[PDB]
Design a protein around this ligand. Structure first.
Ligand SMILES: N[C@@H](CNCc1ccccc1)P(=O)(O)O
Ligand SMILES: [Zn+2]
Length: 865
């Protein structure tokens, strides 16, 4: 079994200076001809090309080449000692391509996805990102079937053939790696706009969609123009072509793709209107449209030496899209949302069998490493440069990064060096954030003796499957102090008297002296989540209530609430296990009452403060887990909050409706009220499920946009009333022709806490709008079920068997979707013995499949072995 190792990296024996491509699109086959201008780097070595398409011919300098084709590699031993050409002819059947990698068909149209290694599915090539070439692409096709023919760069020629065909020629003047190649051919509607760069150059913007979906593309276009302006004002970065194209496609594996000048998007990150998209969907479009554009510099102009360096572009580009969204609106709230998502999804990864460093040392299948760790923890690592250096210093690093490496394929070490060198500071220890996996754990103690607050902090990083030795890391801990009345207390640290400081922990144990403290204090720690770590400090319940009510930092307030909730659930686990009455939670209920009644609070922030940690967060660190016990305990807490404050949930709902003020379009302000409203709806229907029939009677009046319909359907989704089923069926009927809304329907089917979810899911598999071969649908229904705790972790094992069945089935045509799905089983070793046994049986059965993909095999091996 082939494993790739970072320590084995070697520069390529050959460079490709020019890549000329010719696509002849017919029915059913597409014939691809290439002309590569190849430049020897290590003269005399064999030319090795990667490829898996059907090979028709290979030429060196016009003559039939002496070559051998073995597996997915073509080798030519006799190659010239100086510049030469290679010509390859391949044949593709795009309509048979259900992997959605390479050239494939969707909705009668043709699209490409080449990152990471899909280009070799199109032609034989040196398909690695440190090989950068200048591409020119000619496309020929039937004009009526394929009137729109697109590739990277500038369209420099085109014309008609008298047999109903036409052609175009695209020239991309920027050298690029193959993973950034894109082609689109089809009958697509176009929406046109433009942006003028700060140097005075118009950029034509073109969004391509189906004719029916064109009316839904407006918000994405506006978001792009906002992102372009923002990269100019915040980073000083300008676009470098006079054309920027975005193409939406409904069959797509990930979210979107940053192909130079020709971005290709999952429809879910381009299309919205208030009737069919939620406020959260809009925010997602804004984020991802920004993300892909920001890749133009962080990814395209400077790219990755090798795929181990993926976080070099993804961590940084995620950081950029986070800052973009934050500058647009609601910075504090949106920051909390990112932290929440990291701890809910990335922390369990770092604690599990597939844990890896932000920059992995090895991989079998690279598609398995487009992970929360590489992306979200990657972004947290980039943000720590910002925390250490400040915005000004961070931009100095960026400026030097581009000065040095524009046009190059580089490494995480080069980004760090740019930050270090531009600011004259030593960041050698910072490298460990790239090479050491696992969530660091801080233990802190505070004492006020004399007029100095003495904060002692230890750090440790647990062994991960790849590495036992973990050395102390560079961890910035932002701190402040509160007095008995919860106001900011000033202190002296490193010369400056301020109310806030960044304590830089670099050793296994350090003591920090905050001096000039003239009051009794409790510290506020890890403000703004200043490093991606666990922090344990001895807080009393009243310390937490004080932080929640009076602290100035959004994260620390939110973290205080999260802690009170965590403790309450732990109390529930204890009583439920002992077989006694539930706890009173008197302190918690008092704290929540204050939050509900506090009108100074941003409504979106209030909503977050009223959110309870997920089961996964709750059993983090536990062994021999019974997931249903954690579910029962969490549900009990939610039911107590629902019934206890039922009157106030109604009142808050009423206030939210009044303040929304019939403003049903997306805006950050309106969205905040609706978010709070939807929290209230969930609680109301927990306490009084019979309220569903009142809801049903007035459904039309309440369904003023999708945020409301989703909010309501989400709230009733676990209701055992027949009305729940009727409302869902009416939803499916209303939006039957909207694929993105049908995704929501299937998500509700799969995620329901009702007792009959497994059989409803199996019925949904046969719904005429469901397609297993469509990633959005597969993820919505099956993905949602796999995350449905009481059902996936059903004691009889029905959930495990069902998901293993679907991993096996899906892997036969789309290993990427299957390899993400199988990670539902990651908790295996931490489960109580009965469920553990059943999960291992499921994984063994997956492993026993003939022809199991490398993708799924890698994951299963990490869990099982
Ligand atoms: N670089 C992009 C990765 N998404 C595309 C992709 C990658 C692998 C397989 C299929 C699709 P993003 O981070 O979304 O900008
Ligand atoms: Zn990206």
């Amino acid at each position: 079994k082939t494993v790739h190792y970072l320590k084995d990296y070697q520069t390529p024996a050959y460079h490709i200076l020019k890549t000329d491509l010719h696509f002849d699109i017919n029915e059913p086959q597409t014939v691809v001809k290439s002309r590569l201008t190849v430049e020897p780097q290590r003269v005399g070595e064999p030319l090795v090309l990667d490829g898996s398409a059907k090979l028709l011919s290979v030429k060196i300098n016009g003559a039939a080449a002496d070559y051998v084709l073995e597996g997915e590699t073509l080798t030519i031993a006799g190659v010239p000692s100086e510049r030469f050409t290679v010509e390859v002819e391949t044949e593709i059947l795009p309509a048979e391509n259900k992997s959605l990698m390479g050239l494939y068909a969707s909705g009668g149209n043709l699209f490409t996805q080449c990152e990471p290694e899909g280009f070799r599915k199109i032609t034989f090539y040196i398909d690695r990102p440190d090989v950068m070439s200048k591409f020119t692409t000619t496309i020929v096709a039937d004009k009526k079937r394929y009137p729109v023919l697109l590739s990277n760069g500038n369209k420099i020629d085109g014309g008609e053939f008298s047999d109903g065909r036409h052609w175009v020629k695209w020239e991309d003047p920027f050298s690029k790696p193959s993973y950034l190649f894109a082609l689109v051919a089809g009958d697509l509607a176009v929406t046109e706009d433009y942006f003028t760069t700060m140097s005075g150059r118009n950029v034509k913007i073109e969004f391509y969609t189906t004719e029916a979906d064109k009316p839904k593309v407006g918000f994405a276009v506006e978001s792009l123009k906002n992102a372009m302006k923002w990269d100019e004002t915040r980073f000083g970065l300008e676009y470098d072509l006079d054309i920027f194209m975005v193409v939406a496609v409904g069959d797509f594996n990930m979210g979107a793709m940053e192909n130079k000048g020709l971005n290709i998007f999952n429809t879910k990150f381009v299309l919205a209107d208030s009737r069919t998209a939620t406020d959260t969907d809009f925010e997602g479009i804004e984020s991802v449209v920004g993300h892909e554009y920001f890749h133009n510099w962080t990814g395209n102009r400077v790219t990755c030496r090798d795929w181990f360096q993926l976080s070099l572009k993804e961590g940084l580009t995620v950081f950029r899209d986070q800052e973009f969204s934050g500058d647009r609106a609601s910075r504090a709230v949106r920051r909390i949302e990112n932290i929440r998502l990291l701890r809910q999804h990335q922390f369990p990864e770092d604690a599990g069998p597939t844990a890896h460093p932000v920059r992995p040392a090895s991989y079998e299948e690279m598609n398995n490493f487009y992970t929360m760790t590489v992306y979200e923890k990657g972004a947290e690592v980039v943000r720590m440069y910002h925390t250490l250096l400040g915005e000004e210093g961070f931009q100095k690093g960026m400026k030097l990064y581009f000065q040095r490496h524009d046009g190059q394929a580089v490494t995480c070490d080069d980004f760090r060096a740019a930050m270090a060198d531009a600011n004259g500071i030593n960041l050698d220890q910072f490298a460990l954030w790239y090479s050491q996996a696992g969530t660091p754990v801080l233990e802190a103690e505070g004492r006020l003796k004399n007029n100095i607050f003495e904060l002692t902090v230890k750090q440790t990083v647990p062994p991960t499957p790849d590495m036992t030795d973990k050395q102390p890391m560079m961890i910035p801990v932002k701190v402040g102090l509160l007095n008995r009345n919860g106001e900011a207390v000033a202190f002296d640290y490193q010369g400056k008297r301020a109310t806030e400081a960044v304590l830089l922990l670099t050793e296994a144990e350090q003591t920090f002296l905050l001096e000039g403290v003239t009051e009794a204090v409790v510290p506020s720690l890890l403000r703004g989540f200043s490093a991606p770590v666990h922090l344990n400090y001895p807080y009393s319940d009243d310390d937490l209530l004080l932080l929640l009510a009076h602290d100035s930092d959004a994260f620390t307030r939110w973290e205080a609430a999260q802690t009170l909730y965590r403790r309450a659930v732990a109390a529930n686990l204890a009583t439920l296990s002992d077989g006694v009455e539930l706890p009173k939670h008197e302190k918690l209920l008092a704290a929540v009452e204050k939050v509900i009644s506090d009108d100074l609070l941003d409504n979106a922030f209030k909503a977050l403060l009223l959110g309870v940690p997920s089961e996964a967060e709750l059993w983090d660190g536990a062994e021999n887990i019974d997931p249903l016990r954690y579910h029962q305990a969490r549900e009990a807490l939610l039911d107590t909050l629902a019934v206890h404050f039922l009157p106030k949930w109604h009142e808050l709902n009423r206030q939210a409706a009044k303040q929304e003020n019939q403003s049903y379009e997306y805006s950050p302000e309106a969205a905040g009220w609706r978010t709070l409203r939807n929290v209230c709806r969930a609680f109301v229907l927990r306490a009084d499920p019979a309220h569903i029939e009142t809801v049903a009677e007035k459904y039309g009046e309440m369904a003023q946009n999708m945020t409301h319909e989703w909010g309501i359907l989400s709230a009733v989704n676990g209701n055992e009333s027949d009305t729940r089923n009727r409302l869902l069926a009416q939803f499916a009927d209303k939006f039957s022709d909207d694929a993105l809304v049908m995704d929501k329907y299937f998500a509700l089917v799969g995620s329901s806490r009702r007792s009959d979810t497994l059989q409803q899911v199996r019925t949904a598999l046969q719904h005429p709008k469901f397609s297993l071969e469509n990633p959005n649908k597969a993820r919505s229904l099956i993905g949602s079920f796999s995350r449905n705790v009481p059902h996936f972790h059903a004691e009889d094992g029905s959930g495990y068997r069902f998901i293993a069945d679907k991993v096996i089935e899906i892997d036969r045509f789309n290993p990427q979707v299957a390899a993400r799905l199988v990670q539902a089983f990651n908790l295996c070793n931490k489960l109580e013995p009965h469920r553990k046994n059943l999960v291992k049986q499921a994984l063994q059965r997956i492993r026993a499949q003939e022809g199991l993909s490398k993708d799924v095999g890698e994951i299963v091996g990490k869990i099982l072995d």
